[model samples]
Target: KCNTATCATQRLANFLVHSSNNFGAILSSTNVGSNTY
Candidate 1:
């Protein structure tokens, strides 16, 4: 039961994925647009 935010966060951060003693590359795709040309 994923009812608690803390639990969900822990689950993802703890058992999400890992290898070569490195964290997963869960990156997001987005930009803050352009700034003053």
Candidate 2:
């Protein structure tokens, strides 16, 4: 059961897409939105 916060977080992810091997594309979507948490 997904009762715990950690478990819910793990399930909330819909896909596992890779952006870049060099990690440079990581910040491409940084300014896309303001993080609330």
Best by lDDT: 1
Model 1: C-alpha RMSD to truth? 7.5
lDDT per residue (tens digit) for residues 1-37 in model 1: 5748878876667655553233332222122243333
Clashing residue pairs in all predictions, respectively, total 0, 0
**TM-score of each model, paired residue for residue:** 0.30, 0.28
Q: What is the lDDT of candidate 1?
A: 0.48
Q: All candidates' lDDT scores? A: 0.48, 0.46
Q: Quote the lDDT for 6 in model 1.
A: 77
Model 2, residue 19: what's the lDDT? 34
lDDT, residue 31, model 2: 43
Report how far off residue 9 is in candidate 1 (Å).
0.4
CA RMSD per model (angstroms): 7.5, 7.1
Q: Which stretches of candidate 2 lie over 4 Å from their true place?
A: 15-37
